[PDB]
């Protein structure tokens, strides 16, 4: 299928003492492969997947330098934004940044992203054409005019369409044994007698990869959303994901209900029924 590489960056100012907390994570599809935490002792970009350890010391030295440079940019941005919004030095504030690229199943470039938030709200983001900017307010409009004059978009575009795609491909090849394997959901249904007249059917999808999945309930072959509950897809902790969907049904009518599971790892959707 298609693939993506994404980097997430969070920086939280610490007014009482010292510099902002900075945390960077890198992810190929739903696999975290690098991290940097300014509170950690290494002060290094660290591997989080076996296949990235194939990279030599020049890789770790250069990514460490660059992620520290990223952290300094976020540090001075927190200061710039404090002034743009006329905020005091007493308060803690947050910047968040995500960027990366998508490629299709042919590994050709699909889509690039670069978006930035301040205190949990959109600030500025590169448009899908990778040429113009979306500025949410007049502070971000000042940044937009500055970045337009310096042609920042052209630099980011060269990376998003070029460097990013080439290295995503290299990672996908080095990590083929996991990055290019799909893990279909392991499914089962459980039954819970709520009261004397109602029961809950819970349809489980376990140990799947990647995270994208669809669970639906049908009654007599028609989609049902009333009296259902779907939890957020959640990490198992071993690199796979979990989800469940439940429906409340009249006791004795369980057989009218089917759970339908769609996932990239399945040749065709699965249907589960309580019998």
């Amino acid at each position: 299928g298609s693939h993506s590489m994404r980097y997430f960056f969070t920086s939280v100012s610490r007014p009482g003492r010292g510099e902002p907390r900075f945390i960077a994570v890198g992810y190929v599809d739903d696999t975290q492969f690098v991290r940097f935490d300014s509170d950690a002792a290494s002060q290094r970009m660290e591997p989080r997947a076996p296949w990235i350890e194939q990279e030599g010391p020049e890789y770790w030295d250069g990514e460490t330098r660059k992620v520290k440079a990223h952290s300094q940019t976020h540090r001075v941005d927190l200061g710039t934004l404090r002034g743009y919004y006329n905020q005091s030095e007493a308060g803690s504030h947050t910047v968040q940044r995500m960027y990366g690229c998508d490629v299709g199943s042919d590994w050709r470039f699909l889509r690039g992203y670069h978006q930035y938030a301040y205190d949990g709200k959109d600030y500025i983001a590169l448009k899908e054409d990778l040429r113009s900017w979306t500025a949410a307010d007049m502070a971000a409009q000042t940044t937009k005019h500055k970045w337009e004059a310096a042609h920042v978009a052209e630099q980011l575009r060269a990376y998003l369409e070029g460097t990013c795609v080439e290295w995503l491909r290299r990672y996908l090849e080095n990590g083929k044994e996991t990055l290019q394997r799909t893990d279909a959901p392991k499914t089962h249904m459980t039954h819970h007698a709520v009261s004397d007249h109602e029961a809950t059917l819970r349809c489980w999808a376990l140990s799947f990869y990647p995270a994208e999945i669809t669970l639906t309930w049908q009654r007599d072959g028609e989609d049902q959303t009333q009296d259902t509950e779907l939890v957020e897809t959640r990490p198992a902790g071993d690199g796979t994901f979990q989800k469940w969907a439940a429906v409340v049904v009249p006791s004795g009518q369980e057989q009218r209900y089917t759970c339908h599971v769609q996932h990239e790892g399945l040749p065709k959707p699965l249907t589960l029924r309580w019998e």
């Binding site: 990514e63 660059k66 440079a69 990223h70 001075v76 710039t80 500055k146 970045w147 920042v152």
Partner: peptide, 9 residues
């Protein structure tokens, strides 16, 4: 692989 340059606001 990270961006080589991250321009400040």
């Amino acid at each position: 692989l990270l961006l080589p340059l991250l321009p400040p606001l």
